[PDB]
Enzyme design. Structure first.
Site, PDB file in Angstrom:
ATOM      1  CE  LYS A 182       0.624  22.332  14.250  1.00 32.32           C
ATOM      2  NZ  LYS A 182       1.193  21.095  13.605  1.00 32.32           N
ATOM      3  CB  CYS A 219       9.725  34.701  16.012  1.00 34.41           C
ATOM      4  SG  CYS A 219       9.289  33.346  14.942  1.00 34.41           S
ATOM      5  CG  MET A 220       8.901  36.176  12.040  1.00 35.69           C
ATOM      6  SD  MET A 220       9.778  34.778  11.295  1.00 35.69           S
ATOM      7  CE  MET A 220      10.333  35.440   9.750  1.00 35.69           C
ATOM      8  CG  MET A 261      12.363  29.703  14.633  1.00 34.66           C
ATOM      9  SD  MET A 261      12.484  31.504  14.640  1.00 34.66           S
ATOM     10  CE  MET A 261      11.901  32.010  13.046  1.00 34.66           C
ATOM     11  N   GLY A 311       6.829  32.074  11.259  1.00 35.60           N
ATOM     12  CA  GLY A 311       6.317  31.029  12.106  1.00 35.60           C
ATOM     13  C   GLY A 311       4.909  31.222  12.627  1.00 35.60           C
ATOM     14  CD  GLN A 312       3.811  34.466  17.098  1.00 35.61           C
ATOM     15  OE1 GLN A 312       2.879  34.687  17.848  1.00 35.61           O
ATOM     16  NE2 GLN A 312       4.954  35.172  17.129  1.00 35.61           N
TER      17      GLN A 312
HETATM   18  N1  LIG Z   1       3.880  21.982  14.829  1.00 35.62           N
HETATM   19  C1  LIG Z   1       4.243  23.279  14.941  1.00 35.62           C
HETATM   20  N2  LIG Z   1       4.433  24.077  13.847  1.00 35.62           N
HETATM   21  C2  LIG Z   1       4.827  25.383  13.997  1.00 35.62           C
HETATM   22  C3  LIG Z   1       5.020  25.912  15.362  1.00 35.62           C
HETATM   23  C4  LIG Z   1       4.796  24.987  16.472  1.00 35.62           C
HETATM   24  O1  LIG Z   1       4.917  25.361  17.665  1.00 35.62           O
HETATM   25  N3  LIG Z   1       4.428  23.745  16.180  1.00 35.62           N
HETATM   26  N4  LIG Z   1       5.393  27.178  15.585  1.00 35.62           N
HETATM   27  C5  LIG Z   1       5.533  28.086  14.470  1.00 35.62           C
HETATM   28  C6  LIG Z   1       6.522  29.177  14.747  1.00 35.62           C
HETATM   29  S1  LIG Z   1       5.967  30.490  15.687  1.00 35.62           S
HETATM   30  C7  LIG Z   1       7.754  29.128  14.186  1.00 35.62           C
HETATM   31  S2  LIG Z   1       8.846  30.410  14.418  1.00 35.62           S
HETATM   32  C8  LIG Z   1       8.179  28.017  13.231  1.00 35.62           C
HETATM   33  C9  LIG Z   1       9.500  27.381  13.642  1.00 35.62           C
HETATM   34  O2  LIG Z   1       9.838  26.481  12.577  1.00 35.62           O
HETATM   35  P1  LIG Z   1      11.336  25.993  12.206  1.00 35.62           P
HETATM   36  O3  LIG Z   1      12.263  27.151  12.394  1.00 35.62           O
HETATM   37  O4  LIG Z   1      11.311  25.361  10.831  1.00 35.62           O
HETATM   38  O5  LIG Z   1      11.394  24.841  13.307  1.00 35.62           O
HETATM   39  P2  LIG Z   1      12.477  24.650  14.465  1.00 35.62           P
HETATM   40  O6  LIG Z   1      12.416  23.196  14.908  1.00 35.62           O
HETATM   41  O7  LIG Z   1      12.284  25.742  15.503  1.00 35.62           O
HETATM   42  O8  LIG Z   1      13.944  24.888  13.812  1.00 35.62           O
HETATM   43  C10 LIG Z   1      14.291  24.443  12.499  1.00 35.62           C
HETATM   44  C11 LIG Z   1      15.672  23.837  12.546  1.00 35.62           C
HETATM   45  O9  LIG Z   1      16.636  24.783  12.991  1.00 35.62           O
HETATM   46  C12 LIG Z   1      17.767  23.933  13.156  1.00 35.62           C
HETATM   47  N5  LIG Z   1      19.057  24.537  13.583  1.00 35.62           N
HETATM   48  C13 LIG Z   1      19.674  24.465  14.790  1.00 35.62           C
HETATM   49  N6  LIG Z   1      20.868  25.114  14.782  1.00 35.62           N
HETATM   50  C14 LIG Z   1      21.057  25.588  13.535  1.00 35.62           C
HETATM   51  C15 LIG Z   1      22.118  26.351  12.824  1.00 35.62           C
HETATM   52  O10 LIG Z   1      23.153  26.707  13.412  1.00 35.62           O
HETATM   53  N7  LIG Z   1      21.935  26.656  11.527  1.00 35.62           N
HETATM   54  C16 LIG Z   1      20.825  26.267  10.864  1.00 35.62           C
HETATM   55  N8  LIG Z   1      20.743  26.630   9.567  1.00 35.62           N
HETATM   56  N9  LIG Z   1      19.812  25.538  11.433  1.00 35.62           N
HETATM   57  C17 LIG Z   1      19.862  25.203  12.744  1.00 35.62           C
HETATM   58  C18 LIG Z   1      17.264  22.776  13.992  1.00 35.62           C
HETATM   59  O11 LIG Z   1      18.025  21.590  13.726  1.00 35.62           O
HETATM   60  C19 LIG Z   1      15.827  22.662  13.511  1.00 35.62           C
HETATM   61  O12 LIG Z   1      15.622  21.422  12.822  1.00 35.62           O
HETATM   62  O13 LIG Z   1       7.204  26.967  13.062  1.00 35.62           O
HETATM   63  C20 LIG Z   1       5.850  27.392  13.133  1.00 35.62           C
HETATM   64  N10 LIG Z   1       5.023  26.225  12.954  1.00 35.62           N
HETATM   65  N1  LIG Z   2      13.822  27.117  23.486  1.00 35.40           N
HETATM   66  C1  LIG Z   2      13.042  27.789  22.590  1.00 35.40           C
HETATM   67  N2  LIG Z   2      12.151  28.739  22.996  1.00 35.40           N
HETATM   68  C2  LIG Z   2      11.380  29.421  22.095  1.00 35.40           C
HETATM   69  C3  LIG Z   2      11.483  29.104  20.667  1.00 35.40           C
HETATM   70  C4  LIG Z   2      12.452  28.060  20.321  1.00 35.40           C
HETATM   71  O1  LIG Z   2      12.598  27.764  19.133  1.00 35.40           O
HETATM   72  N3  LIG Z   2      13.168  27.465  21.296  1.00 35.40           N
HETATM   73  N4  LIG Z   2      10.721  29.752  19.744  1.00 35.40           N
HETATM   74  C5  LIG Z   2      10.369  31.130  20.009  1.00 35.40           C
HETATM   75  C6  LIG Z   2       9.334  31.617  19.002  1.00 35.40           C
HETATM   76  S1  LIG Z   2       9.690  31.642  17.354  1.00 35.40           S
HETATM   77  C7  LIG Z   2       8.105  31.994  19.355  1.00 35.40           C
HETATM   78  S2  LIG Z   2       7.009  32.432  18.146  1.00 35.40           S
HETATM   79  C8  LIG Z   2       7.718  31.985  20.803  1.00 35.40           C
HETATM   80  C9  LIG Z   2       6.242  31.649  21.000  1.00 35.40           C
HETATM   81  O2  LIG Z   2       5.965  31.691  22.410  1.00 35.40           O
HETATM   82  P1  LIG Z   2       4.530  31.962  23.039  1.00 35.40           P
HETATM   83  O3  LIG Z   2       3.857  32.995  22.206  1.00 35.40           O
HETATM   84  O4  LIG Z   2       4.754  32.121  24.521  1.00 35.40           O
HETATM   85  O5  LIG Z   2       3.834  30.492  22.866  1.00 35.40           O
HETATM   86  P2  LIG Z   2       2.271  30.197  22.743  1.00 35.40           P
HETATM   87  O6  LIG Z   2       1.987  28.853  23.349  1.00 35.40           O
HETATM   88  O7  LIG Z   2       1.845  30.440  21.294  1.00 35.40           O
HETATM   89  O8  LIG Z   2       1.509  31.288  23.665  1.00 35.40           O
HETATM   90  C10 LIG Z   2       0.303  31.946  23.198  1.00 35.40           C
HETATM   91  C11 LIG Z   2      -0.733  32.113  24.324  1.00 35.40           C
HETATM   92  O9  LIG Z   2      -1.952  32.700  23.842  1.00 35.40           O
HETATM   93  C12 LIG Z   2      -3.057  32.090  24.542  1.00 35.40           C
HETATM   94  N5  LIG Z   2      -4.258  32.357  23.734  1.00 35.40           N
HETATM   95  C13 LIG Z   2      -4.833  31.599  22.781  1.00 35.40           C
HETATM   96  N6  LIG Z   2      -5.894  32.272  22.210  1.00 35.40           N
HETATM   97  C14 LIG Z   2      -6.017  33.490  22.799  1.00 35.40           C
HETATM   98  C15 LIG Z   2      -6.904  34.694  22.700  1.00 35.40           C
HETATM   99  O10 LIG Z   2      -7.877  34.851  21.906  1.00 35.40           O
HETATM  100  N7  LIG Z   2      -6.610  35.691  23.522  1.00 35.40           N
HETATM  101  C16 LIG Z   2      -5.594  35.647  24.389  1.00 35.40           C
HETATM  102  N8  LIG Z   2      -5.405  36.734  25.142  1.00 35.40           N
HETATM  103  N9  LIG Z   2      -4.754  34.626  24.568  1.00 35.40           N
HETATM  104  C17 LIG Z   2      -4.910  33.523  23.799  1.00 35.40           C
HETATM  105  C18 LIG Z   2      -2.619  30.642  24.592  1.00 35.40           C
HETATM  106  O11 LIG Z   2      -3.356  29.933  25.572  1.00 35.40           O
HETATM  107  C19 LIG Z   2      -1.155  30.794  24.942  1.00 35.40           C
HETATM  108  O12 LIG Z   2      -0.976  30.844  26.362  1.00 35.40           O
HETATM  109  O13 LIG Z   2       8.466  30.968  21.457  1.00 35.40           O
HETATM  110  C20 LIG Z   2       9.852  31.254  21.439  1.00 35.40           C
HETATM  111  N10 LIG Z   2      10.492  30.384  22.431  1.00 35.40           N
HETATM  112  S1  SF4 Z   3      -1.953  26.988   8.795  1.00 35.83           S
HETATM  113 FE1  SF4 Z   3      -0.284  25.667   9.632  1.00 35.83          FE
HETATM  114  S2  SF4 Z   3      -1.081  24.445  11.410  1.00 35.83           S
HETATM  115 FE2  SF4 Z   3      -2.806  25.389  10.245  1.00 35.83          FE
HETATM  116  S3  SF4 Z   3      -3.536  23.728   8.774  1.00 35.83           S
HETATM  117 FE3  SF4 Z   3      -2.011  24.973   7.606  1.00 35.83          FE
HETATM  118  S4  SF4 Z   3       0.053  24.068   7.957  1.00 35.83           S
HETATM  119 FE4  SF4 Z   3      -1.420  23.156   9.472  1.00 35.83          FE
HETATM  120  C1  LIG Z   4       6.596  34.700  14.489  1.00 36.52           C
HETATM  121  N1  LIG Z   4       6.919  33.659  14.894  1.00 36.52           N
HETATM  122 MO   LIG Z   5       7.879  32.020  15.976  1.00 40.35          MO
END
Ligand SMILES: Nc1nc2c(c(=O)[nH]1)N[C@H]1C(S)=C(S)[C@@H](COP(=O)(O)OP(=O)(O)OC[C@H]3O[C@@H](n4cnc5c(=O)[nH]c(N)nc54)[C@H](O)[C@@H]3O)O[C@H]1N2
Ligand SMILES: Nc1nc2c(c(=O)[nH]1)N[C@H]1C(S)=C(S)[C@@H](COP(=O)(O)OP(=O)(O)OC[C@H]3O[C@@H](n4cnc5c(=O)[nH]c(N)nc54)[C@H](O)[C@@H]3O)O[C@H]1N2
Ligand code: SF4
Ligand SMILES: [C-]#N
Ligand SMILES: [Mo]
Ligand SMILES: O=N[O-]
Length: 720
Positions: A46, A137-138, A305, A342-343
């Site tokens: 990525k 998220c956090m 998460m 995560g973010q």
């Molecule tokens: N490739 C990639 N990397 C990312 C992101 C992305 O969109 N893509 N997004 C980023 C963001 S914003 C975030 S918040 C993080 C999310 O990163 P993680 O939280 O590490 O990833 P998730 O797959 O959301 O969830 C982790 C695990 O929670 C588990 N889970 C489900 N139910 C339960 C439960 O009851 N207890 C426990 N202990 N675990 C459970 C699921 O099995 C899952 O494997 O990653 C960040 N990094």
């Molecule tokens: N079912 C389910 N839903 C979830 C989660 C899950 O685990 N399960 N995870 C939750 C969590 S932890 C998170 S963090 C949220 C994330 O949810 P979102 O924040 O909705 O996901 P993103 O795709 O990161 O959206 C970011 C946007 O910013 C835009 N963008 C990129 N660069 C710029 C810029 O310079 N300026 C502006 N104005 N816009 C820009 C991108 O095109 C994109 O549309 O999702 C949550 N939703």
């Molecule tokens: S900050 Fe996250 S997505 Fe970016 S290079 Fe490092 S591990 Fe990969």
């Molecule tokens: C913050 N995800």
């Molecule tokens: Mo997140």
């Protein structure tokens, strides 16, 4: 080939890898990792493929307006767009009061953007309707850190990975979600093979393939599992009384002062044999995890998460902290309780900046009269300008939009029509015919733009400069590497002009650029335990991040918080080696949180847990990673994971099409069949816009942090 390299920060995960951007003739041509940042010049796929994202022509490059609800989005000039924005927001306030308007922002906004927006709203308009996606998220980890320690944010850093001797990784797919940090975890076990790794997650992910033990517990039952670990630790005399007798207070199930005997008495309710059947794990896993945890020379926990996205989210964070506190596996290199963010900027922009509805910058709280006065003074406001009531938190914000109580909203660098929970309910709220929704969005394929009345074209990533604060208290600068295309403008500048035009006092937004706002943010942090006054722009251009507390220009930053000699907020002359100064007696707190479950547990009618997860190739809603062909190669479209022994029992084979149904919706998805999901569990990813999985998910929230329980609800499966 590059004529110059421009230092910044990966646009994606909370690992916050530093990046060098290769530019030639005003165009980015290459990228490499910052050798001088924590990641040591390593990036994941990525990060490496960010250049095609930066170079994409699939961009919002002019302002757009939707004249009437349901209409086409059509070109409009910047000045017309800003007047419409200013006049609508000002009229809403004039007529209905400050609480009629709202900001819904992002841990992806630069710290400077979120700082300006937060100030405009809270000090300018007089509303605390400022919230953002870290709420999703956090917020559970903030609650856990604040209730256990009195202050937010981890007390260790990524460097502790290099010295831990046990890792307890719960609610985390580190390899898919924080790849560089997972590589560092694997690396440490490669170098010290005595290193032990417990991965606790109902799913068997690539993260577990370095685990000594994978605990595939039943969803919702990890609180009991973790209490059961403390029972064992206590029972086998593996606890650390020299630590907890001096440094720890205990609080009962009612939240009243208790003690170690009270703790012991409470824990009788979580004996391994009884909790093993609750969790559906062999009992030896409780003893194994506990012993590894406690016996190890140094233990680090990491979670994401699976712990935070839970109605018992805060409580689960507390229970992790309990283990570190009963054993004294804390405030030592290797030994720390490390919540993973995560973010890229939830920490810097939203949590530290207090850009949530109940918060104020650098540790301050809205309900707190002294903090309000501290801010009115710092920001040059009349007394009482800052409202004493918290504004709407995200879920309730969008509920208020649905009722018509919030009339004007700004959405900035988030995609809530794709990512909020309970989407059918949210899409209705977002379709309120008299609502005015302004979107700052870089990519036209964001589904939320179908709801916008006005769209403002932003500078993206390193088209402009500003700070990102990653999960380890590291503040790193991105310098500007290229010009924004078309009519794209930095959001820091857009916000100032918005404010000005909407009748906000110009002394409140006295910023030419993002550097200007940083210096003020620096000032507003000064003297707090979030103090980073020593992070000048000059320092941040030369260094690859500084870790706060960093109170002055000759201070190197802080790795061990709460530690005399290492943390400048611990008086040099403090009597004890540690000091949890977020609590008035200097002691952290072990909380005796009763273990419950999901808001919506399975029953006869819906016999399955449904979870939702990350996948490595895709960033959230895929508006960025979707522009990269190579990131589409493994997982092009959405699927639903189903357990093998579950599948066979109900006649589901692989690649077969299934209808996942919940109380709220029904979605066809091709089945992916493995032992990844434990029996009685299915999982859906959320990157696909053709499969808005959050239509299936319930909406229930932690009563304290107000984070939605995306990680659990009840579902059922049926052969299409
Ligand atoms: N490739 C990639 N990397 C990312 C992101 C992305 O969109 N893509 N997004 C980023 C963001 S914003 C975030 S918040 C993080 C999310 O990163 P993680 O939280 O590490 O990833 P998730 O797959 O959301 O969830 C982790 C695990 O929670 C588990 N889970 C489900 N139910 C339960 C439960 O009851 N207890 C426990 N202990 N675990 C459970 C699921 O099995 C899952 O494997 O990653 C960040 N990094
Ligand atoms: N079912 C389910 N839903 C979830 C989660 C899950 O685990 N399960 N995870 C939750 C969590 S932890 C998170 S963090 C949220 C994330 O949810 P979102 O924040 O909705 O996901 P993103 O795709 O990161 O959206 C970011 C946007 O910013 C835009 N963008 C990129 N660069 C710029 C810029 O310079 N300026 C502006 N104005 N816009 C820009 C991108 O095109 C994109 O549309 O999702 C949550 N939703
Ligand atoms: S900050 Fe996250 S997505 Fe970016 S290079 Fe490092 S591990 Fe990969
Ligand atoms: C913050 N995800
Ligand atoms: Mo997140
Ligand atoms: O990585 N989105 O499920």
């Amino acid at each position: 080939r590059p004529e110059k390299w421009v230092k910044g920060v990966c646009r994606y995960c909370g690992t916050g890898c530093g990046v060098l951007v290769g530019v030639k003739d005003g165009k980015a041509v290459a990228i490499q990792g910052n050798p001088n940042n924590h990641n040591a010049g390593l990036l994941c796929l990525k990060g490496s493929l960010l250049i095609p994202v930066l170079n994409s022509k699939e961009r919002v490059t002019q302002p757009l307006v939707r004249r009437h609800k349901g209409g086409k989005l059509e070109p409009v000039s910047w000045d017309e767009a800003l007047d419409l924005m200013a006049s609508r927001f000002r009229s809403s306030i004039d007529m209905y009061g400050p609480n009629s308007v709202a900001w819904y922002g992002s841990g992806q906004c630069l710290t400077e953007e979120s700082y300006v927006a937060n100030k405009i709203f809270k000090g300018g308009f007089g509303t605390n309707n400022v919230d953002g996606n870290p709420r999703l998220c956090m917020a559970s980890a903030v609650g856990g850190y604040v209730t256990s320690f009195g202050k937010d944010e981890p007390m260790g850093t990524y460097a502790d990975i290099d010295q831990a001797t046990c890792f307890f990784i719960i609610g985390s797919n580190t390899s898919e979600a924080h790849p560089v940090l997972f590589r560092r975890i694997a690396r440490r076990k490669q170098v010290e093979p005595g290193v032990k790794i417990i991965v606790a997650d109902p799913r068997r992910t690539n993260t577990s393939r370095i685990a000594d033990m994978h605990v595939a517990f039943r969803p919702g039952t990890d609180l009991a599992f973790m209490h059961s670990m403390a029972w064992v630790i206590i029972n086998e005399e593996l606890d650390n009384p020299r630590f907890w007798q001096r440094y720890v207070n205990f609080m009962d199930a009612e939240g009243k002062p208790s003690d170690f005997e009270g703790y012991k008495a409470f824990l009788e309710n979580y004996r391994p044999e009884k909790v093993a059947e609750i969790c559906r794990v062999p009992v030896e896993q409780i003893y194994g995890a506990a012993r590894a945890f406690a016996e190890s020379a140094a233990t680090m926990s990491l979670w994401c998460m699976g712990i935070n996205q839970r109605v018992q989210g805060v409580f689960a964070n507390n229970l992790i902290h309990n283990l570190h506190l009963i054993t004294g596996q804390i405030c030592r290199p290797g030994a720390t309780s490390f919540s993973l963010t995560g973010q890229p900027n939830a920490c810097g922009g939203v949590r530290d900046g207090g850009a949530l509805s109940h918060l104020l910058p650098a540790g301050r709280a809205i309900p707190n009269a002294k903090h309000r006065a501290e801010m009115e003074k710092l920001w040059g406001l009349p007394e009482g300008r800052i409202a004493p009531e918290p504004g709407y938190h995200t879920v309730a914000l969008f509920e208020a939009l649905g009722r018509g109580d919030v009339k004007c909203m700004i959405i900035c660098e988030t995609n809530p029509a794709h990512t909020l929970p309970n989407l059918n309910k949210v899409h209705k709220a977002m379709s309120h015919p008299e609502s005015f929704i302004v979107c700052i969005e870089a990519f036209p394929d964001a589904v939320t733009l179908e709801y916008a009345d006005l769209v403002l074209p932003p500078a993206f990533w390193c088209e402009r400069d500003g700070v990102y604060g990653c999960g380890e208290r590291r503040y790193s600068l991105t310098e500007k590497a290229v010009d924004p295309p078309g009519q794209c403008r930095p959001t820091v500048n857009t916000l100032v002009e918005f404010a000005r035009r909407a009748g906000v006092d110009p002394q409140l937004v006295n910023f030419r650029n993002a550097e200007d706002v940083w210096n003020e943010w620096r000032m507003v942090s000064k003297g707090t335990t979030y103090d980073f006054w020593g992070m000048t722009r000059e320092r941040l251009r030369k260094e690859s991040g500084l870790i706060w507390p960093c109170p002055s220009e000759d201070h190197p930053g802080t790795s061990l918080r709460y530690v005399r000699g290492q943390d400048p907020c611990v008086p040099a002359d403090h009597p004890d080696r540690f000091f949890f100064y977020g609590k008035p007696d200097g002691r952290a707190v072990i909380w005796m949180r009763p273990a419950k479950g999901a808001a919506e547990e399975p029953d006869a009618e819906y016999p399955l847990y449904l979870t939702s997860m990350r996948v490595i190739d895709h960033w959230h809603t895929a508006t960025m990673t979707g522009k990269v062909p190579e990131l589409q190669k493994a997982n092009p479209i959405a699927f639903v994971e189903i357990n093998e022994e579950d599948a066979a029992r109900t006649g589901i084979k692989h690649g077969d099409s299934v209808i996942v149904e919940t109380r709220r919706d029904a979605m066809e998805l091709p089945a992916r069949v493995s032992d990844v999901c434990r029996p009685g569990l299915i999982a859906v990813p959320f990157f696909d816009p053709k499969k808005l999985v959050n239509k299936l998910f319930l909406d229930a929230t932690d009563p304290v942090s107000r984070e939605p329980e995306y990680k659990i609800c009840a579902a059922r499966v049926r052969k299409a």
